[PDB]
Design a protein around this ligand. Structure first.
Ligand SMILES: CN(C)Cc1ccc([C@H]2C[C@@H]2C(=O)Nc2nc3ccc(-c4cn[nH]c4)cc3s2)cc1
Ligand SMILES: CN(C)Cc1ccc([C@H]2C[C@@H]2C(=O)Nc2nc3ccc(-c4cn[nH]c4)cc3s2)cc1
Lengths: 243, 246
């Protein structure tokens, strides 16, 4: 991908904590979000290298990397509405169910591509999705939190695209609940035992029974019983089409 | 990339021919341009494969490939204003100079990325760029790693020698198209006339809407020797400075 010179970046305002994130411009033209880098530089950079070779409409894009001056940073396209979790909260009460479903559809399209690419996200959550023009949703940080973790993950550290699917289920809950916090006020140990016991998140009122069904498919205890993103995509679309 | 089942595509209206292109939807949801494939299927597909691993905000994207039934098709994101050449022609008279310069920047950003990846476009012209929301421009048809003299550098029309530097020559002509609002380059001229004019150092006149600064950059792109043309990476900074300076 393209190397970007420090001189070409305008840092207009912070909007992120972690490294940090700024709203800015590149070449005084393109609106961008700039991510400044503990964690090795080479890993931070390789993460960008991975994402710059994964092109999908529902996956965020970089303009490039700025390695000249410390701290180094990555330059992403600016997303007009920012993080999905925030957007859900601020726009709470304005969402039709069809729209919320559309959002899950976007993410699932992104993830089905990643799945195909043999890429495991490991941290899929609304906070790791972005909201752009016309409320299109993109997945972010896909080139590398018990509440989004599958049972085999928090128990055996066994990641797969199937563990990502679990996380996607929780993302769906976040979306349909208009940005509520999952297992709020529950400790990590409580989440683990509760889920191992069979507990699942409740159906948010804007989620039809059809939507909740799919959520529960994502939350199947055995990875092999969860649908791959590619099949999950068609399940979600079917719900939309049936009205 | 993702495989797309034929059942998932709705074909609304034909928007282009050349395979055919249709406005459509995938999953009754995402607005898409579907490109239906004589030419090799394996090449048609590899083209998509190349494009799916090149992610840049100024390069067009695919939702996936639909292989299951012939004629097979590629499924691109829909670009609301379509082909840049067409858009320029239909909206001729309405563009501000700043808008036209912004369009060249968009393309140059995409090309710098391809350049860095050692991807040689070979057919960089307005008709091979697309205009999306907010009039962003994306480069298209950059996946073919394996006629049109009007976009051809001398080393191309003489020796069929392609490189990022011949792409840059082509880009210069693209700039001309943009600032001329979709006019035909070398309109009254035969191929041999073009070869002669270029070979003797002559270049496309400066369009009314191009400033002298814009025209300077066109001319850098039209250096006789490829080694004298700036890389897309450097061209970018030249273009940005002109927007800045006003
Ligand atoms: C009021 N309007 C017109 C101006 C305005 C100002 C600020 C914002 C911020 C919510 C917008 C935002 O946060 N955009 C972002 N885009 C990205 C893109 C990528 C990344 C990113 C990718 N990996 N790491 C970070 C973060 C952001 S935040 C929106 C609108
Ligand atoms: C007016 N509205 C309601 C209908 C309508 C009809 C036609 C158009 C055409 C300008 C639109 C257009 O042609 N869009 C296109 N998008 C793409 C995207 C990718 C590709 C492509 C990439 N490789 N090969 C083809 C071609 C097109 S044409 C817009 C709106």
């Amino acid at each position: 991908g393209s190397v970007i010179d420090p001189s070409e970046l305008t840092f207009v305002q912070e909007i992120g904590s972690g490294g940090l994130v700024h709203l800015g411009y590149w070449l005084n033209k393109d609106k961008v979000a700039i991510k400044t880098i503990a964690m090795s530089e080479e890993d931070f950079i390789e993460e960008a290298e991975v994402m710059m070779k994964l092109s999908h409409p529902k996956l965020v894009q970089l303009y490039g990397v700025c390695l000249e001056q410390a701290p180094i940073c990555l330059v992403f396209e600016f997303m007009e509405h920012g993080c999905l979790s925030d957007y859900l909260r601020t726009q709470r009460g304005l969402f039709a169910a069809e729209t919320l479903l559309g959002m899950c559809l976007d993410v699932c399209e992104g993830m089905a591509y990643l799945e195909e690419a043999s890429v495991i996200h490991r941290d899929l959550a609304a906070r790791n999705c972005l909201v752009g023009e016309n409320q299109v949703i993109k997945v972010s940080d896909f080139g590398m939190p018990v509440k989004w973790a599958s049972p085999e993950v928090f128990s055996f550290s066994r990641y797969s695209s199937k563990s990502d699917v679990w996380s996607f289920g929780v993302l769906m809950w976040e979306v349909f609940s208009e940005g509520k916090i999952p297992y709020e006020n529950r400790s990590n140990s409580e989440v683990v035992e509760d889920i191992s016991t069979g507990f699942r998140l409740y159906k948010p009122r804007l989620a039809s029974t059809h939507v909740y069904q799919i959520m529960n498919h994502c939350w199947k205890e055995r990875p092999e019983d969860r649908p791959a993103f590619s099949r999950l995509l068609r399940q979600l679309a079917a719900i939309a089409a049936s009205g």
